[PDB]
């Protein structure tokens, strides 16, 4: 597309109990990280790497409109499997989804958003390395990935 190939390749997230995926940056907005620098700090640990910074540009533009945590939570709640009757209930549902359903192994406590942002950023960071070719793709057959 004209503008489709200009921004590049954008990253989305398929969170549980959501019918349709959401932009990755939106999930960071919901977790409480609003500014781009705060979000990118959890994804790119070395700002001196121009290659990594470009990979996240299309993702930032996709979620440019959403600029507040409550706005982001409503967007996540709006796409929930059981959309809320009102906007306030949508935010509560989205908060519950991220609180327990998203990355539960990281934590389920009400104050684990920071830990979930780091791991989610690590998931994005790992994806960028695969996209950049810096790290080899995981092997399903590798038996240390099995239980």
């Amino acid at each position: 597309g004209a503008k489709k190939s200009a921004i590049g390749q954008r990253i989305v997230a398929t969170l549980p109990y959501i019918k349709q995926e959401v932009p990755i940056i939106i999930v960071f907005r919901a977790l409480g990280f609003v500014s781009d620098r705060d979000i990118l700090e959890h994804i790119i640990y070395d700002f001196e790497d121009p290659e990594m910074m470009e990979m996240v540009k299309p993702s930032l533009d996709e979620a440019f409109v959403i600029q507040e945590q409550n706005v982001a939570l409503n967007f996540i709640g709006s796409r929930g499997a059981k959309p809320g009757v009102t906007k306030e209930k949508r935010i509560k549902y989205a908060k519950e989804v991220l609180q327990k359903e998203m990355l539960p192994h990281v934590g389920v406590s009400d104050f684990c958003e920071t830990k979930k942002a780091y791991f989610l950023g690590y998931m994005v960071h790992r994806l960028l390395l695969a996209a950049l070719g810096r790290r080899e793709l995981d092997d399903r057959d590798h038996y240390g990935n099995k239980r």
Binding site: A2, K3, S5, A6
Partner: protein, 38 residues
């Protein structure tokens, strides 16, 4: 003769004289890289 081969591109003068003067180059740059056939 120069060790580096270069090709400078700029938008038409008539349009300069609607989408975006900056983003449009990226659309052209991406479009020319793949869609254009040499």
């Amino acid at each position: 003769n120069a060790e580096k081969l270069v090709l400078r591109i700029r938008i038409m003068n008539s349009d300069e004289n609607k989408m975006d003067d900056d983003v449009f180059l990226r659309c052209i740059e991406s479009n020319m890289l793949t869609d254009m056939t040499l």
